[PDB]
Amino acid sequence: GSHSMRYFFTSVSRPGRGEPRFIAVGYVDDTQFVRFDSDAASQRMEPRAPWIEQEGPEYWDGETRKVKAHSQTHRVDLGTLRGYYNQSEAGSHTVQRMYGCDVGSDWRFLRGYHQYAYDGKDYIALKEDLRSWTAADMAAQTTKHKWEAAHVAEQLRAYLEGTCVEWLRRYLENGKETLQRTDAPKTHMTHHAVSDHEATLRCWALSFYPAEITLTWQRDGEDQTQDTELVETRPAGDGTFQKWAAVVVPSGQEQRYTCHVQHEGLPKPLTLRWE
Amino acid sequence: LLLPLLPPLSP
Amino acid sequence: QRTPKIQVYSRHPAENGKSNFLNCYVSGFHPSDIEVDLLKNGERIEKVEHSDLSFSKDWSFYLLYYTEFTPTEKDEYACRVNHVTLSQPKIVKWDRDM
């Protein structure tokens, strides 16, 4: 399978007093492994997965220096954007940035990306070729022009195809016992009468990793999409994910209905049926 | 590992 | 501009007398300022932690708020959320079967 390394950055201006709140989180696939929060006491990049603690003091110093530099870029950008959008000093505004790189199953560079948003809307993004930019609006046309002229994409591409994937491969190896372990969903069905004549069948998928999953109900071997209640996939809090799908059926007809579970940790999809 | 340098929108 | 969606649930299938984790997963909201409390019998629980702020491909934020708890037959739990998009707090009662 492919693997990704992604960094997510949020900075929020504080118009009443002080500088923006800045939060950075790094992920390998669906595993958080570092964080920085300008409101925390340490003022350090901090570990959030055991395998990143294999890195020595030079890593924490270097990532702290860089993440503070990232914070200052976001702070200045909030000022720039307030000007571009002719906004007052009194409002709070947000920048969000996500960048990262993927390796394929061949452990080589697969893709890289860098997306930026202002006040929860697309602003500018690096195109798939890692050489050009997409601007969402006319303000972002200014950034596209300036980043073209300053060859911002060229240093970004160098990182995405080089250092980014090199360190992703490092992390995947160091953390292989978890990062490259799939946790197939533990699946079960529950049955809840809602009347003497109707019952809810709920199909549960628990403790799975990664988060990508498909749960579907069928009746007589064809899809039963319209009648399914499907909750959004949600974190268990221990690094795994949860999901369920439910259907209401006539009592005594439960055997017609099947729950189908697709997950990359399964060699073949699972089929569950209430006896 | 983070990007070594993060250019602003406008320097 | 975007209202928080709420799921309130236990980390593990709930059994009275067995320690567990009560989760409130808030997602789909913007901007990021948000107030989330876990309630036991209507009362705010004090030692509640949360995940580090991240966001989805539509730029909406998500957070997990969580606390340890030992469920019982008589105790009720809920998640209380306030956000600029809400006129007053949104409160979802915990249901052990969802």
Numbering used by the authors:
A (entry chain A): 2 to 276
B (entry chain C): 1 to 11
C (entry chain B): 3 to 100
Published text:
MHC class I proteins, encoded by the highly polymorphic human leukocyte antigen (HLA)-A, -B and -C genes, present a snapshot of the intracellular proteome on the cell surface (immunopeptidome) where T cells surveil the peptide–MHC complexes (pMHC) for antigens derived from foreign pathogens. The typical 8–14mer peptide presented on MHC class I comprises only around 2–3% of the amino acids in the pMHC complex and is spatially confined within the adjacent α-helices of the MHC groove, thus posing major challenges for engineering peptide-specific single-chain antibody variable fragment (scFv) binders. One peptide each from CHRNA3, GFRA2, HMX1, IGFBPL1, PHOX2B and TH were selected for preclinical development.
To select those peptides with the highest potential as putative immunotherapeutic targets, we prioritized peptides on the basis of pMHC binding affinity, HLA allele frequency, degree of differential expression of parent genes, relative abundance on MHC as compared to other peptides, recurrence across multiple neuroblastoma tumours and relevance to neuroblastoma biology based on the published literature.
